[PDB]
Amino acid sequence: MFLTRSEYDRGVSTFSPEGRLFQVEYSLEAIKLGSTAIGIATKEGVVLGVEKRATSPLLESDSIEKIVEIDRHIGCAMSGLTADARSMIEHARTAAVTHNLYYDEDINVESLTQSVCDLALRFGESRPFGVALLIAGHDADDGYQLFHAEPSGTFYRYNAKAIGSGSEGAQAELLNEWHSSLTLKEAELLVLKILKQVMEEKLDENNAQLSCITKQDGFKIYDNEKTAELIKELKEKEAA
């Protein structure tokens, strides 16, 4: 093992000779270390899935929630639930309700994604802020949309995106599998298939949580029983 350091490392708000801000680069790779979240967008819905930590049998429920409702139209997934994730979510919630009472109309998903990025450029009020988000929603202009909002205060729209544990091979299988033609059921099976591969081959309703956005029901997180029949549908469909 050898050492590869540099004189411009840990430089805050400082360009290196190359024009690099290494702090925001470092923050942007810590997204590899969290719990796995996956988003699939289709003409039928946006599906968000996340790996759940195993819990004591005595735990009846908890306020750890890596998939969160922002609005009826908009849902969100984290790889970590630090104070900065809470700050971004309660900013996104306050941004949604203020737009609703101003225009009598639902916020566009790009405009909400832009708003949580502006919070990270402001640092609340060249620093990174908080954690990677997947942001999913439907609006009448740009349909079903999935965005990666980043600690840098910048973002991209994706057709499918994986964050957290598993990054290189997690997005490698998604670009191999994604179609314009995916049905919603098929997208759910695909996020469960990807979750099984990243989890070193374990899959229960106790370690996979699913959700989707549709126009008709909006954002909903699936019951353990709904994800359990979907896991059985995966287990038979791969064995067939």
Check residue 63 for interaction with other proteins (CB under 8 A): yes
Check residue 160 for interaction with other proteins (CB under 8 A): yes
The CB-of-147 to other proteins minimum distance in angstroms stands at: 9
The answer to whether the beta carbons of residues 109 and 73 sit under 8 Å apart is yes
Can you tell me whether residue 1 is helix, strand or coil? coil
In angstroms, what CA-CA distances link 162 with 51, 137, 142, 146, 170?
12, 17, 22, 11, 6
Check residue 209 for interaction with other proteins (CB under 8 A): no
Residue 94 and residue 71: Cα distance in Å, rounded?
10
Comparing CB distances to other proteins, the nearer of 57 and 101 is 57
Using the rule CB under 8 A, which residue among 6, 29, 97, 183 binds other proteins?
Answer: 29
Q: How long a stretch of residues is the chain? A: 240
The CB-of-196 to other proteins minimum distance in angstroms stands at: 20
The two structure tokens encoding residue 162? 């994986």
β-pair type (208-214, 45-51) = antiparallel
Chain centroid to CA 199: how far? 17
**Which range of residues in 57-65, 95-103, 183-191, 201-209 is near other proteins by CB under 8 A?**
57-65
Comparing CB distances to other proteins, the nearer of 29 and 238 is 29
The answer to whether the beta carbons of residues 141 and 110 sit under 8 Å apart is no
The CB-of-235 to other proteins minimum distance in angstroms stands at: 25
Using the rule CB under 8 A, which residue among 54, 61, 125, 200 binds other proteins?
Answer: 61
Cα four-point dihedral sign 116, 121, 122, 128: positive
Comparing CB distances to other proteins, the nearer of 59 and 240 is 59
β-pair type (67-71, 45-51) = unpaired
Comparing CB distances to other proteins, the nearer of 10 and 237 is 10
Q: What is the binding site for other proteins (CB under 8 A)?
A: 1-4, 7, 10, 13-23, 26-27, 29-30, 33, 56-64, 82-83, 86-87, 121, 126, 128, 152-154, 156-161, 171, 174-175, 178
